[PDB]
Amino acid sequence: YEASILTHDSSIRYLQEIYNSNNQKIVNLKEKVAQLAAQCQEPCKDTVQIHDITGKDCQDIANKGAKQSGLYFIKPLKANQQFLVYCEIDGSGNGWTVFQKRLDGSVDFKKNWIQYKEGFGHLSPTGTTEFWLGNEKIHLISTQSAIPYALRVELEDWNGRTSTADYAMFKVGPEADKYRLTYAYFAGGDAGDAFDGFDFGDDPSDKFFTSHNGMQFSTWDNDNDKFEGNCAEQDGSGWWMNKCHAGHLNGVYYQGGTYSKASTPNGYDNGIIWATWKTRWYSMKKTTMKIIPFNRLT
Template sequence: ERSNPGNNRKRLPRSCKQRSTVSGLYYIKPLKAKQQFLVYCEIDSSGLGWTVIQRRLDGSVDFNKNWNQYKEGFGYLSPTDTTEFWLGNEKTHLLSTQSTIPYVLRIEVEDWTGQKSTADYATFRLGSEKDNYRLTYAYFIGGDAGDAFDGYDFGDDPSDKFFTSHNGMQFSTYDKDNDKFEGNCAEQDGSGWWMNRFHAGHLNGKYYRGGTYSEADAQPAGYDNGIIWVTFRTRWYSMMKTSMKIIPFNRYGTDGGQQFVSKGSKAGDI
């Protein structure tokens, strides 16, 4: 359904519809959701509908929010997709766990020269709030942006890759610390994320105009706190634009739109 809160006659879709032709705002109601909510559906060139769960593009929204704000979502949804937002961990949890058909997560990054790239992950899901919205996925599908979620060897320590991986990490905010660090990464970085001890990918970081920033810019802590994806650009380069979007695996297409269905899934589960 397009955004029309008064129209409750038809059963609302559980996610962005497969055959929608126009990107825009739609009401959806995942299987276990108590009520409908608004999402931005991005329709790609194959006509497939991605549900966008994060958007950064101009630094207009402060991503240094508390646990409840990240749970419920913040920012602004616009029909022209020209605003920054976080859809909300609870909404993403409901979306990604509602079916036997798993979801694909796509990370999109764009640097300050306009170069764009993607990274796709299979069987993405967020756990419940009881599990602190734990991020899990099965494997990295591909994409020129590279697999920053798997961690990165910065050359500082043999444990770099292990302590910068994000798969299996719980969500942290400045008022709810679930990371592996002695301190509070979310508080130091000024944003919520699936923190390990450190990070190799962090799309909710501080918005630095121009891209390159330094330890002096990242005060008071001096840590790399920008919008980073280190397999695409260094940890001292902050992206101009990013998005995170999800789609059911049986609607995910590559190589001219070839469709993939995970083992054991049934058509019509979503």
């Protein structure tokens, strides 16, 4: 209101005391701000990590000690640069190099020549993503000097049933020969030999024109099939087409597994099929194509 001069001194010091008191708290606060900064320097922790061990292929890495399935870098002999891959490693010490995966339909497989050559999709440590490693890489892995390779196809329906198809002496040629697919023989498997063709009973040469051994690779922008039309374009995918196919794991992902002649625009069966195990109008739910040295397979 209007205190006395006698009060001015008691008060005058009261302010100086909290003022200094304040400057102190601040000195310590600024300090604490410093300690906080030291805690906010690291980036967010990425769950996905790539393993250190590398080699010519997954089996080579498994031999070097690796034990768990994950992302690794491999560098085949003829490979100019190294590249990332997904290795599946079992308890027996087998290291498969996976080059194809289907499981949800999240990845569009209607890609072009370069895309199928260089690869697309994503690699995950948990092996829960869809992808195509890339023709050139597959060629490089499967044609290392004096190393006979084997291919295993894994299928799963929408009822938890899984089947297999093995092929000995699996090989994929160079771009110069349009990444032609070849193998010595069907190594057996409860999924059946779709690569050998399948009699659809709609013609005499059905079988012959649905076989895949010896077939080059085809994409909409690069036709190399044994049909005057364009399989890859009509079926909208990239694959070793004949006229057209008996086994088609890079086809359109149909939810539920069951689809019809109506589902498609042209009418042709363009799903993820494998005739020797299910009808043309049954697209698988999960798919995986992996390779490993033949000597390693039994």
